[PDB]
Structure formats: structure tokens, C-alpha cells
Design an enzyme around this catalytic site. Structure first.
Site, PDB file in Angstrom:
ATOM      1  N   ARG A 100      30.171  13.751   4.727  1.00 31.76           N
ATOM      2  CA  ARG A 100      30.293  13.537   3.289  1.00 31.76           C
ATOM      3  C   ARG A 100      28.953  13.124   2.695  1.00 31.76           C
ATOM      4  NH1 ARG A 100      34.729  13.162   0.153  1.00 31.76           N
ATOM      5  NH2 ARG A 100      33.455  11.812  -1.195  1.00 31.76           N
ATOM      6  N   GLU A 123      24.140  -0.194   4.060  1.00 32.63           N
ATOM      7  CA  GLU A 123      23.707  -1.502   3.591  1.00 32.63           C
ATOM      8  C   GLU A 123      24.505  -2.607   4.273  1.00 32.63           C
ATOM      9  OE1 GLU A 123      24.716   1.023   1.510  1.00 32.63           O
ATOM     10  OE2 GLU A 123      22.652   1.746   1.331  1.00 32.63           O
ATOM     11  N   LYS A 183       0.906  -1.087   0.000  1.00 29.72           N
ATOM     12  CA  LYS A 183       0.000   0.000   0.000  1.00 29.72           C
ATOM     13  C   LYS A 183       0.940   1.127   0.000  1.00 29.72           C
ATOM     14  CE  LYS A 183      -2.816  -1.819   2.966  1.00 29.72           C
ATOM     15  NZ  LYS A 183      -3.247  -1.607   4.357  1.00 29.72           N
TER      16      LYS A 183
HETATM   17  C1  LIG Z   1       1.506  -4.297   8.866  1.00 31.86           C
HETATM   18  C2  LIG Z   1       1.021  -3.772  10.175  1.00 31.86           C
HETATM   19  C3  LIG Z   1      -0.333  -3.807  10.485  1.00 31.86           C
HETATM   20  N1  LIG Z   1      -0.760  -3.285  11.763  1.00 31.86           N
HETATM   21  C4  LIG Z   1      -2.154  -3.335  12.061  1.00 31.86           C
HETATM   22  C5  LIG Z   1      -2.838  -2.051  11.776  1.00 31.86           C
HETATM   23  C6  LIG Z   1      -4.218  -2.486  11.516  1.00 31.86           C
HETATM   24  O1  LIG Z   1      -4.985  -2.274  12.631  1.00 31.86           O
HETATM   25  C7  LIG Z   1      -4.129  -3.940  11.229  1.00 31.86           C
HETATM   26  C8  LIG Z   1      -4.700  -4.269   9.880  1.00 31.86           C
HETATM   27  O2  LIG Z   1      -4.230  -3.371   8.922  1.00 31.86           O
HETATM   28  P1  LIG Z   1      -4.651  -3.596   7.415  1.00 31.86           P
HETATM   29  O3  LIG Z   1      -3.372  -2.769   7.095  1.00 31.86           O
HETATM   30  O4  LIG Z   1      -5.377  -2.434   6.654  1.00 31.86           O
HETATM   31  O5  LIG Z   1      -3.914  -4.708   6.573  1.00 31.86           O
HETATM   32  P2  LIG Z   1      -4.782  -5.815   5.879  1.00 31.86           P
HETATM   33  O6  LIG Z   1      -4.173  -7.210   6.158  1.00 31.86           O
HETATM   34  O7  LIG Z   1      -6.228  -5.727   6.439  1.00 31.86           O
HETATM   35  O8  LIG Z   1      -4.799  -5.538   4.356  1.00 31.86           O
HETATM   36  P3  LIG Z   1      -5.960  -4.682   3.757  1.00 31.86           P
HETATM   37  O9  LIG Z   1      -5.393  -3.446   3.102  1.00 31.86           O
HETATM   38  O10 LIG Z   1      -6.709  -5.497   2.732  1.00 31.86           O
HETATM   39  O11 LIG Z   1      -6.900  -4.279   4.868  1.00 31.86           O
HETATM   40  O12 LIG Z   1      -2.788  -4.320  11.303  1.00 31.86           O
HETATM   41  C9  LIG Z   1       0.125  -2.733  12.741  1.00 31.86           C
HETATM   42  O13 LIG Z   1      -0.273  -2.303  13.810  1.00 31.86           O
HETATM   43  N2  LIG Z   1       1.494  -2.715  12.391  1.00 31.86           N
HETATM   44  C10 LIG Z   1       1.985  -3.208  11.157  1.00 31.86           C
HETATM   45  O14 LIG Z   1       3.174  -3.167  10.905  1.00 31.86           O
HETATM   46  C1  LIG Z   2      28.381   4.448  -1.745  1.00 28.69           C
HETATM   47  C2  LIG Z   2      27.987   4.456  -0.413  1.00 28.69           C
HETATM   48  C3  LIG Z   2      28.590   5.326   0.485  1.00 28.69           C
HETATM   49  N1  LIG Z   2      28.198   5.337   1.828  1.00 28.69           N
HETATM   50  C4  LIG Z   2      28.862   6.280   2.756  1.00 28.69           C
HETATM   51  C5  LIG Z   2      30.344   6.023   2.873  1.00 28.69           C
HETATM   52  C6  LIG Z   2      30.651   7.264   3.655  1.00 28.69           C
HETATM   53  O1  LIG Z   2      29.977   7.158   4.910  1.00 28.69           O
HETATM   54  C7  LIG Z   2      29.948   8.316   2.794  1.00 28.69           C
HETATM   55  C8  LIG Z   2      30.873   8.875   1.697  1.00 28.69           C
HETATM   56  O2  LIG Z   2      31.147   7.915   0.668  1.00 28.69           O
HETATM   57  P1  LIG Z   2      32.427   8.106  -0.255  1.00 28.69           P
HETATM   58  O3  LIG Z   2      33.410   8.735   0.638  1.00 28.69           O
HETATM   59  O4  LIG Z   2      32.741   6.704  -0.616  1.00 28.69           O
HETATM   60  O5  LIG Z   2      31.941   8.929  -1.369  1.00 28.69           O
HETATM   61  O6  LIG Z   2      28.845   7.598   2.170  1.00 28.69           O
HETATM   62  C9  LIG Z   2      27.234   4.507   2.260  1.00 28.69           C
HETATM   63  O7  LIG Z   2      26.891   4.523   3.440  1.00 28.69           O
HETATM   64  N2  LIG Z   2      26.610   3.621   1.372  1.00 28.69           N
HETATM   65  C10 LIG Z   2      26.990   3.596   0.026  1.00 28.69           C
HETATM   66  O8  LIG Z   2      26.442   2.817  -0.751  1.00 28.69           O
HETATM   67 ZN   LIG Z   3      27.863  -0.186  -0.181  1.00 28.34          ZN
END
Ligand SMILES: Cc1cn([C@H]2C[C@H](O)[C@@H](COP(=O)(O)OP(=O)(O)OP(=O)(O)O)O2)c(=O)[nH]c1=O
Ligand SMILES: Cc1cn([C@H]2C[C@H](O)[C@@H](COP(=O)(O)O)O2)c(=O)[nH]c1=O
Ligand SMILES: [Zn+2]
Ligand SMILES: Cc1cn([C@H]2C[C@H](O)[C@@H](COP(=O)(O)OP(=O)(O)OP(=O)(O)O)O2)c(=O)[nH]c1=O
Ligand SMILES: Cc1cn([C@H]2C[C@H](O)[C@@H](COP(=O)(O)OP(=O)(O)OP(=O)(O)O)O2)c(=O)[nH]c1=O
Ligand SMILES: Cc1cn([C@H]2C[C@H](O)[C@@H](COP(=O)(O)OP(=O)(O)OP(=O)(O)O)O2)c(=O)[nH]c1=O
Ligand SMILES: Cc1cn([C@H]2C[C@H](O)[C@@H](COP(=O)(O)OP(=O)(O)OP(=O)(O)O)O2)c(=O)[nH]c1=O
Ligand SMILES: Cc1cn([C@H]2C[C@H](O)[C@@H](COP(=O)(O)OP(=O)(O)OP(=O)(O)O)O2)c(=O)[nH]c1=O
Ligand SMILES: Cc1cn([C@H]2C[C@H](O)[C@@H](COP(=O)(O)O)O2)c(=O)[nH]c1=O
Ligand SMILES: Cc1cn([C@H]2C[C@H](O)[C@@H](COP(=O)(O)O)O2)c(=O)[nH]c1=O
Ligand SMILES: Cc1cn([C@H]2C[C@H](O)[C@@H](COP(=O)(O)O)O2)c(=O)[nH]c1=O
Ligand SMILES: Cc1cn([C@H]2C[C@H](O)[C@@H](COP(=O)(O)O)O2)c(=O)[nH]c1=O
Ligand SMILES: Cc1cn([C@H]2C[C@H](O)[C@@H](COP(=O)(O)O)O2)c(=O)[nH]c1=O
Ligand SMILES: [Cl-]
Ligand SMILES: [Cl-]
Ligand SMILES: [Cl-]
Ligand SMILES: [Mg+2]
Ligand SMILES: [Mg+2]
Ligand SMILES: [Mg+2]
Ligand SMILES: [Mg+2]
Ligand SMILES: [Mg+2]
Ligand SMILES: [Mg+2]
Ligand SMILES: [Zn+2]
Ligand SMILES: [Zn+2]
Ligand SMILES: [Zn+2]
Ligand SMILES: [Zn+2]
Ligand SMILES: [Zn+2]
Lengths: 135, 135, 135, 135, 136, 135
Positions: free
Chosen positions: D24, D69, D2
Site C-alpha cells: 500500500r 514513526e 550541511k
Molecule cells: C558527523 C560525522 C563526521 N565524521 C567525520 C568525517 C570527518 O572526517 C570528520 C569531520 O567532518 P567535518 O564534517 O567537515 O565536520 P566539522 O565539525 O569539521 O564541521 P565543518 O563543516 O566546519 O568542518 O568527522 C564521520 O566520520 N561520521 C559522522 O557522522
Molecule cells: C499514514 C502513515 C501510514 N503508514 C503505513 C501504514 C501502512 O503500512 C501503509 C498504508 O497506510 P493506510 O493503509 O493507512 O493508508 O502506510 C506509515 O507507515 N506511516 C504513516 O504515517
Molecule cells: Zn503515524
């Protein structure tokens, strides 16, 4: 480890022992840890066996059947929680072979209500560092 | 399960069989699942036992020693994660007793290199549904 | 926790490095914790890659290939088990970037057999408080 | 999926990119699976590192710092859940090295807001069967 | 689909742990079962460390601070390091509407209960939210 | 706990309060433990419920709607991690009902931004051990 709590557990072992389906002797064994019953085992044939009858034609026990303690520990291996540091409520004092694995499993204490005919099982658990309580 | 990985698993079983302190037979048993060795078990006397020698004098095996399968099974009870749906790499073909608990534990397949003196466990395994390969 | 069990893990690491299709250098690395090998990784191309070949047509290493340590790390990410508290067995000393991630992973110790030409990876490990032993 | 839940995750990435100390570039990376944030990472020095400053005494990046990452992946390793079959929300498109490990991890899809200088990370992600989305 | 003797064994286990309730107006128990394991036994009572384990006020009505057996069962699962999702519940008494709400959202598959409470409306919530109900 | 990261947790609760389909009020709750977000809940109807609208035509609230705190609690029961020992970040102070369950769950502390109309919920937390900070 309240006497009221422990009774409920031992009564739970007794109650799952009544599923055993065996006629020689009905044995139950549950694994208790952190306020949770992690496994309940009872004596019977392996899963999906061609029969759930534990007896042979002379009325002696089918060699294929598993003990209560066997099924409990095997189930623990199938589960996703640890058996180590847990407690064990048996309806009967465990078999010497089973007691070997129970100790190696790190079970801290074994509770049994009834005393089996042979009693070397208790004696094995004690040698291997597992406390015993009869209730 | 490519066959160069299958070999590596089997050789891992043999590596851990070599750390066993039993001199009648050195046996290792490995539990493998989702690219993980969840348990490595070898034959020997229980933990905290007074002696780590698996023999009596007679050349007899101490009645207290555990099989490589018993240990691997127990460690799966001892730890988290499940032995269910996993595969077993043994150096030697397992006995009838352990093969009962192996099948009950929901082990899919048993890999063994050497065939023991008596081979009833092998035929117990595939009779309870567990696949069996020799390598 | 025992020298022969310690030697078993490292020799298991060498067993899995031989599974690697790479021609330039076959590296292996396994994750050990509570007697369990949670991950065993070796160098190679990502899953489902068009080749399992690790080298380009000019003999240099394909930029898409993963280190043994990267794979050992990634599988833990794919696992339902924690790498925190584990120890690491590698056939070679990990690179500075892998080491960087190894320490952040909460790995207590890194075992390694062959010292790698360029050893800054070791230096990174010590700096970030990771115990290191050669064997 | 959603739409407004999607934005919540992505601005959560921007939110945690802001707690980074690096000048940076501030990157944030959240792992999502089954509607749950299993990991949130940003760029910076390893845990317990002497300084939380990411820059050298000339504005350059300390080779010890972790990518957002990278921390997101390492956190998943320490986690007791699987990153396999999950979605990742980055503030910036990931580098090739992290992209290698992201695909190997089993990440379904990568959501990113800013598109980095070098875009060969998205290249690597796409070739390895990881769907990508700019938002 | 559960074997009748096992289904009976669990329901009686819920009755056993309901006997620890300490409450005197009515003793309620709730068992959480997943994959043949009992992950939580909960029973009605005051919270942990509360000044009294006595569940009733001076007039015979329930202390508002008293947690339901179902509340304790799910709170236990929250503190527990296993999931309640895809599990089934064994109650000595049919859950209340408020608890049945949380039960459904918890991903509980089925609810067995032995004693029908004065007010059905809890079971209504369960059924309408796609959680199977079986009286025994 | 650090100020920069504590605010990030609170704003995270607000991002997730904004995905609530309730026009009467928008609440969010975050569970944080060992520096990680374990659960995020907001007010709304149950999952798979025929409507996502939280209000009736009268304008009052639908009794099927869960508070943001019940959702964070339930998601924790659904989780495979433990809520005990964690901190709860809330956009608004929880109701007395949810406060009982929060306390029983062993929640160390509850951060909140806005006090609700009724403030009884805070008082319940105070009494039942849970620490409370307005931020
Ligand atoms: C994914 C998620 C749902 N919820 C709760 C909120 C809602 O009260 C409940 C249901 O949400 P609904 O999001 O709307 O999800 P659903 O399974 O009913 O899908 P649909 O869109 O068809 O309705 O789940 C959380 O509290 N935290 C979360 O991370
Ligand atoms: C490329 C990249 C850099 N960085 C960070 C590394 C340093 O913290 C900062 C600067 O990157 P750089 O010095 O390599 O340009 O960005 C990430 O966190 N994820 C990434 O994918
Ligand atoms: Zn990276
Ligand atoms: C289900 C279950 C079985 N066991 C044991 C008892 C038996 O020895 C064995 C399984 O027995 P069988 O229950 O009867 O299992 P089954 O799959 O063959 O079902 P059925 O016979 O009706 O076709 O495992 C336990 O110890 N605990 C349990 O929770
Ligand atoms: C560590 C370990 C033990 N075991 C088994 C082998 C033995 O039968 C049993 C106990 O072994 P013992 O290794 O010798 O361990 P211990 O605690 O008794 O230490 P020590 O005897 O030196 O005082 O555990 C395995 O099968 N696999 C393993 O990885
Ligand atoms: C199975 C496995 C793979 N890996 C790594 C090594 C490789 O770099 C990467 C992928 O290896 P590839 O094993 O060769 O897997 P694949 O599915 O691509 O092979 P195929 O197409 O023939 O079926 O995964 C490990 O590190 N440890 C393991 O246990
Ligand atoms: C807590 C946490 C850290 N990290 C990363 C960011 C940093 O690079 C690294 C360490 O974070 P910083 O924790 O705050 O460093 P620290 O562990 O030494 O604590 P302090 O500096 O206050 O003494 O871990 C995440 O990616 N996500 C998280 O949730
Ligand atoms: C132990 C336990 C408690 N509970 C509930 C029942 C109570 O309402 C609540 C706390 O119970 P109290 O057992 O009485 O625990 P306590 O810490 O207050 O110890 P005491 O009162 O004797 O000083 O938790 C369960 O639902 N299941 C359980 O296994
Ligand atoms: C001793 C012992 C027996 N049993 C069961 C197995 C048999 O089916 C039943 C009858 O005993 P017997 O067959 O050993 O005489 O006892 C257990 O389940 N656990 C035990 O520890
Ligand atoms: C038969 C068998 C024996 N063993 C071990 C038991 C003893 O440690 C050793 C000697 O067995 P034995 O005394 O039966 O010859 O072999 C196994 O580990 N697995 C088996 O399947
Ligand atoms: C440095 C390093 C290289 N390798 C692998 C990458 C290739 O498979 C092989 C070639 O490396 P090279 O091209 O750097 O010599 O070495 C690892 O597996 N782990 C490492 O830590
Ligand atoms: C309705 C209901 C009551 N109870 C407890 C509340 C008190 O402990 C006792 C008396 O209920 P009552 O006071 O609400 O009538 O029953 C539950 O544990 N679960 C329930 O679903
Ligand atoms: C009191 C309270 C209400 N809410 C929700 C219930 C509805 O979604 C909305 C309206 O509350 P009300 O209808 O109870 O006044 O606020 C929470 O999410 N948490 C709370 O603590
Ligand atoms: Cl287990
Ligand atoms: Cl993990
Ligand atoms: Cl949980
Ligand atoms: Mg059967
Ligand atoms: Mg010993
Ligand atoms: Mg390949
Ligand atoms: Mg720091
Ligand atoms: Mg009390
Ligand atoms: Mg909905
Ligand atoms: Zn026995
Ligand atoms: Zn055997
Ligand atoms: Zn490397
Ligand atoms: Zn209720
Ligand atoms: Zn509330």
C-alpha cells in the site's frame, strides 16, 4: 585476574590513599569492574567542606569525615556504571558499617592489604556473602 | 515540581515504607530525578540474610539492618544512572550518618514528612549544602 | 517479585493517575525494571499546551491528549534507559494501539487493575506474546 | 545541516522504506541527533508476528502494523539514548497520532519528502512547536 | 586545574599499568580519565589471541601487529559502554601522530604525558587539533 | 542476517561515502549491532579542522585525513554503546592498520563491496578472527 594485574590494582588503591590528607591513617578504596576502575575513594571531609583536615584539636578524627569505602560507594552512586558484580581493592580491611553496604551493593570480592586494628569488618563481609583475599 | 506531584512522590515513599519488615519504625526513601524514581529503599536486613525480622529481643534493632537511606543509596550504586543532582523523598528525617553520604552524593534536596526523635541530620544536611523541606 | 512490592507499584500507578487534569478518566501507567520506576505517565495534553484541560467545549476528549501509556512510552524514548525487559503497571487496560507499541517495546508483562470497557487491548497483548495479569 | 549530509539522512530513510514489505505504502523514518542515526524505522507487523505481509486478504492494512514513526519511537525507547532534542527524517509526512508523540518526545525538527494524502499530521506537528521541512 | 597530588596519582597509575606491557623495547601505558573514574587502562602489546605476547621480532624491532597503548585505550573505550568524549588522557609516553589524530577526533580534552618520545611530531598533531598537552 | 536488510546496510555505507569531500576516493563505514546502525563514518579531515579538503595541492592525501574506519571506530569510543560483537559494513576493504583495531574491538564480521588497491587489510582481518564477506 592475573596476579600481575591484581597487584597493579592494589598499588593503585595505595597510591590514591596517599591523597587522603589525613594524618591518623591514610585509607584508599577502588572499585574494579570489566577492566575499568570505576571509582577511587579515600578518607577525608565532605566535598566543599570548610576544611580538609580530618583531625580535631585533640587529634581525634572529625566525625564529619567519610571512610574510603564510603566515598567509593557514594561515588559509584554518582557515576553511571553499576557497582554490582565488581571487585574492591582496599588498602585496609573495611569498617563493619561499610562492609554492610558493600555486601548489599553486590560486591563479589574485597581485596585488602593491611589488617586494621579491629577486624570485625572482615568478619561482617564473610557473613554477608563476600569473598575476602589478603595480599 | 508542582505540589500535586511532590505529594505523589512523598506518598510513594510511604507506600514502600509499608513493605518493610521492621516494626520499631517503617521508613521509606525515594530517589527522584528527571521524572523517574530511580531507587525505592526501605529499612531492613541485608539481602540473603537468614532472617527478615529487624528486631532483637530487647525490642532492639538488629545492628545488621540497613536504613532506608542506606538502601536507596546502595541501589544507586547497584544500578546504572546517577544519584547526582537528584532529590530525596523520605518518610522520616534522615540520620547524621546517612546525611553525610547524601550530601557527598550530590543530592540537591531532601523531602521528609515526619521529623525523627533527634533532628541533627536535618541540620547536617543544610550545613553541607543540601536543601531541606518538611511536608 | 513479591506480592506486597507488586501491590506497591500498582498503587504508585494509581497515585500518579490522580495527578492527571482529565475529567473523563484518570489513567496512569508506570515503567518498572530492576526495582526502578523508569517512567510514570498519565493522560493529558502535550507539554506547553495552551490548556491542561483534556476536554473540548462539548465534553468530548481533546484529540491532542496523550494516553498514559503513550506518555510512559515517550518518556522512555526521552530517557537514557531501555524499556526492553521492563514490566508495565497501569490503572486500566491499554488500548489496541498502545498495546501494539507496548509489545514492540519489548515489555515482558502488563499489570492492570481496572478492566476497561472495550478490552481488545488485552487481546492484542496476549496475541503478541505479552504476559498479562489483573489485580 | 550541511546540505549533502542532509540528503544522506533522507535517502537513508528512502533506503529503509524499501525494506518494508507493505505494498500500500512504504514509509521510512530515521532519528538523528548530534550527527548520529540513533534509530531507523519502517512500517510493518510487530516483531515475531506470524507474517511480514502488511495487507489483509482484500488489500487493506492490518490494524496490527506499526507506522514507520511508531517503530522509530519504540526503538528509541529500547535504545539507551534520548530522542529528546533530535531530528527525524521521514519519507512521508507523519499521521496525527505519531505527531502527538513526536512532539512530546522533544523532537526539534521533522524532515519529510513525500507529503501524505491527509496533511493534518504536519498541522499537529507545527502547533506543538515542532519545526518542519520538505525536501 | 587538576589538583597536583591527584594529577600525580593518575600519571603514576599509567606507569603501573605500563608495567604489564610485556614488551621489552619500551613499556607504554595510557589511562582514560572521566569524572574521577578510570574508564580504560591500555598498554602496548600484541592483539588478543595473537600467537605471541612477545612484542618484538628477531632483530629487536617492533612487531607491526603490536597495538599502541593509545590504540588499546581507545579500542577499550569502543568496546566499553561509556563515552571517551570530554575525557582526558594519561600517557607514560607521548602518543604518535596517527594515534593523536584519533585522540583528537575522540573528543579528548587534555593529554598528560611523562616521557617525551624521540619524535615530537605526535604532540604537534595534538596541539594543532585543539587538544591541550601538559608534560609532567 | 536477512538479504534485503544486509543490502540496505551496504547502500547506507555508500550514501555516507558520498558526503566525503575527498576527490581521490570516497569511503564509508557502518557499524551494525542488534539490528541497529550505531556508527557511520567516512574519510575526511578531523572536526573543526581549518579545511574540509582531504587532498594537498600536490594531489596526494593530507595525513590529517582519517580513514572511514578510524572515524567509525572513534565515533564508537565517543558513543555510549559497545562495538564488540557487531558487524562492520564498508564500501571498501579496510587498511591493515584499521584492521588491527577492528579485530581488537571484537568485530564479528566485515562486509565490503570494493577491494582496495592493496588487499593486505582483508588478510589481517582473516588472521585476527574477523569474518569477511564481499558483497
Ligand atoms: C558527523 C560525522 C563526521 N565524521 C567525520 C568525517 C570527518 O572526517 C570528520 C569531520 O567532518 P567535518 O564534517 O567537515 O565536520 P566539522 O565539525 O569539521 O564541521 P565543518 O563543516 O566546519 O568542518 O568527522 C564521520 O566520520 N561520521 C559522522 O557522522
Ligand atoms: C499514514 C502513515 C501510514 N503508514 C503505513 C501504514 C501502512 O503500512 C501503509 C498504508 O497506510 P493506510 O493503509 O493507512 O493508508 O502506510 C506509515 O507507515 N506511516 C504513516 O504515517
Ligand atoms: Zn503515524
Ligand atoms: C575528587 C575525589 C574526592 N573524594 C573524596 C575525598 C574527600 O573526602 C572528598 C572531597 O575532598 P575535597 O577533595 O578536598 O573536595 P573539594 O571540592 O572540597 O576540593 P577542595 O577541598 O580542595 O576545595 O571526597 C574521593 O573519595 N574520590 C575522588 O575522586
Ligand atoms: C527489593 C528491595 C530491597 N530493599 C532492601 C530492603 C532490605 O533491607 C534488603 C533486603 O531485603 P530482602 O527483601 O528481604 O530481599 P532478599 O533477597 O533477602 O529476599 P528474602 O529476604 O525474602 O530471602 O533490600 C530496598 O531497600 N528496596 C528494594 O526495592
Ligand atoms: C511530568 C510528567 C508529565 N507527563 C505527561 C502528562 C501530560 O500529558 C504531559 C504534559 O503535562 P503538563 O504536566 O501539565 O506539563 P506542562 O509543562 O504543560 O504544565 P505547565 O504548563 O503548567 O507547566 O506530560 C507524564 O506522563 N508523566 C510525568 O511525569
Ligand atoms: C530490525 C528493525 C525492525 N523494525 C520494525 C519493522 C517491523 O515492523 C518490525 C519487525 O521487523 P521484521 O523484523 O523483519 O519482523 P521479525 O522481527 O518477526 O523478523 P522476521 O519477520 O524475519 O521473522 O520491526 C524497524 O522499524 N527497524 C529495524 O531496524
Ligand atoms: C586486559 C588488557 C589488555 N590490553 C591489551 C594488551 C594487549 O596488547 C592486548 C591483549 O593482551 P593479551 O593480554 O595478552 O590477552 P590475551 O587474550 O591474549 O590473553 P593471553 O595473551 O595471556 O593468552 O590487549 C590493554 O591494553 N588493557 C587491558 O586491560
Ligand atoms: C576503619 C577505617 C578507618 N578509616 C579512616 C577514618 C579515619 O580518618 C582514619 C583514622 O582512624 P580512626 O579515626 O577510626 O581511628 O581511619 C577509613 O577511611 N576507612 C576504614 O574502614
Ligand atoms: C534514624 C533512622 C532509623 N531508620 C530505621 C533503623 C531501624 O530500621 C528503625 C529503628 O531505628 P532505631 O532503632 O534507631 O529506633 O529505623 C531509618 O531507616 N532511617 C533513619 O534515619
Ligand atoms: C483508552 C484510553 C483512554 N485514556 C484517557 C483518554 C482521556 O484522558 C480519557 C477519555 O477517553 P475516552 O474519551 O476514550 O473515554 O481516557 C487513557 O489515558 N488511556 C487509554 O488507554
Ligand atoms: C611511539 C609509541 C610507541 N609505542 C610502543 C610501540 C612498541 O610497543 C614500543 C617501541 O616503539 P617503536 O618500536 O615504535 O620505537 O613502543 C606505544 O605504545 N605508543 C607510542 O606512541
Ligand atoms: C585505504 C583507505 C583509504 N581511505 C581514504 C584515505 C583518503 O581519504 C583516500 C585516499 O587514500 P590513499 O591516499 O591512502 O590512497 O581514501 C579510507 O577512507 N579508508 C581506507 O581504508
Ligand atoms: Cl550508578
Ligand atoms: Cl532511551
Ligand atoms: Cl562506547
Ligand atoms: Mg575538600
Ligand atoms: Mg532478606
Ligand atoms: Mg500541560
Ligand atoms: Mg516479522
Ligand atoms: Mg595476548
Ligand atoms: Mg570539517
Ligand atoms: Zn568503614
Ligand atoms: Zn540513616
Ligand atoms: Zn492508549
Ligand atoms: Zn600511537
Ligand atoms: Zn584504514
Amino acid at each position: 585476574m592475573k596476579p600481575e594485574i591484581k597487584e597493579a590494582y592494589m598499588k593503585t588503591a595505595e597510591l590514591f590513599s596517599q591523597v587522603s590528607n589525613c594524618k591518623r591513617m591514610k585509607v584508599g578504596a577502588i572499585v574494579v569492574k570489566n577492566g575499568s576502575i570505576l571509582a577511587h575513594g579515600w578518607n577525608g571531609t565532605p566535598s566543599g567542606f570548610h576544611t580538609n583536615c580530618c583531625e580535631l584539636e585533640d587529634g581525634s578524627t572529625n566525625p564529619f569525615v567519610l571512610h574510603a569505602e564510603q566515598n567509593a560507594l557514594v561515588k559509584m552512586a554518582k557515576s553511571s556504571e553499576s557497582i554490582d558484580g565488581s571487585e574492591l581493592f582496599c588498602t585496609h580491611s573495611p569498617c563493619p558499617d561499610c562492609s554492610k553496604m558493600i555486601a548489599q551493593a553486590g560486591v563479589k570480592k574485597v581485596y585488602y592489604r593491611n589488617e586494621y586494628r579491629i577486624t570485625d569488618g572482615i568478619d561482617v563481609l564473610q557473613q554477608l556473602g563476600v569473598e575476602v583475599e589478603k595480599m
